[PDB]
């Protein structure tokens, strides 16, 4: 898998087609966002819950989102 | 096992009769020489790189440690102290003799200047 | 400390195969194990390769020498005769 550092590159990946799975995993100190586009797994890890909430708001609506527990 | 190992660490149960292998089998002569001479050769590096020994006595004591002369760190450090004191005494006597010769040559050149001023 | 007084390098063979044969193998084992002065790089790094082949350490210039020494006396005589017949009356 790959680790996207910036937020704009991850949201460009989310805008990019042929991506069929987004997994949001809350953790004890941060939160991880998972895109399974095709044969790779792209992860945006971020430690700000407000930025996670606004990224969930700005997430494109034509795509499935699964929250892990 | 822990009680027996603590007794071995204190130095018990390790006499003459409870040795069933040779001394070179128990503690190897090559390993003893490696530990001994690596310590006696990096103490000279810690002296040379910091302050103590110069460039020229370092190689002499290096070869003298490679030869079986210096048994351990204490007598190595004492022999370095003896050579440092002897070198300090020799350079003190050399500085005194050089100061005497330098004042003599300076006085001779100034007296040559005095005779040249008296001639012209 | 000099340990062996007569056998020299042949003490690895110990007690076997005769005093005269060990004496005759002594000089040529010294000859095959001695480092020779390289005529090209000027160093003493002529290490023995396989038989007939000598190999200097620096500058990697492999030379075809004798089987046990660097120059056979017969080979030096041949080289002197070849240069003499070379400069003798222009072939």
């Amino acid at each position: 898998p790959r680790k996207i550092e910036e937020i704009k590159d991850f949201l460009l990946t989310a805008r990019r087609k042929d991506a069929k799975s987004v997994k949001i995993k809350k953790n004890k100190d941060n939160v991880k966002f998972k895109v399974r586009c095709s044969r790779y797994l792209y992860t945006l890890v971020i430690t700000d819950k407000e930025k996670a909430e606004k990224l969930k708001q700005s997430l494109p609506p034509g795509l499935a989102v699964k929250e892990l527990k | 096992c822990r009680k027996n190992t603590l007794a071995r660490r204190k130095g018990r149960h390790m006499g003459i009769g409870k040795r069933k292998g040779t001394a070179n089998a128990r503690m190897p002569e090559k390993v003893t020489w490696m530990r001994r001479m690596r310590i006696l050769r990096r103490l000279l590096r810690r002296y040379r790189e910091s302050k103590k020994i110069d460039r020229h006595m370092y190689h002499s004591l290096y070869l003298k440690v490679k030869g079986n002369v210096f048994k351990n760190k204490r007598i190595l450090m004492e022999h370095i102290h003896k050579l440092k004191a002897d070198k300090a005494r020799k350079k003190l006597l050399a500085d005194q003799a050089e100061a005497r010769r330098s004042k003599t040559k300076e006085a001779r050149k100034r007296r040559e200047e005095r005779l040249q001023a008296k001639k012209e | 400390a000099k340990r062996t007084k007569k056998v020299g390098i042949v003490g690895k063979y110990g007690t076997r195969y005769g005093a005269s044969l060990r004496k005759m193998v002594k000089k040529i084992e010294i000859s095959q194990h001695a480092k020779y002065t390289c005529s090209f790089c000027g160093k003493t790094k002529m290490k023995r390769r396989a038989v007939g082949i000598w190999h200097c350490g620096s500058c990697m210039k492999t030379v075809a020498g004798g089987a046990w020494t660097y120059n056979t006396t017969s080979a030096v005589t041949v080289k002197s005769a070849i240069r003499r017949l070379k400069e003798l009356k222009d072939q």
């Binding site: - | - | 038989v51 007939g52 082949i53 030379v63 075809a64 080289k79 070379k86």
Partner: protein
Amino acid sequence: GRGAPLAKVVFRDPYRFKKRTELFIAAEGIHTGQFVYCGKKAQLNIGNVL
């Protein structure tokens, strides 16, 4: 199986652009990099076949 050394002398083909490699018996005193000449009018030195 041979106590004599083998020498690997590379030549140049005057007819086609290709460096041909042959296997000579190493004469005494040759060294790697020596220009081993070969032919009829080659000058008499150690290594030169004539």
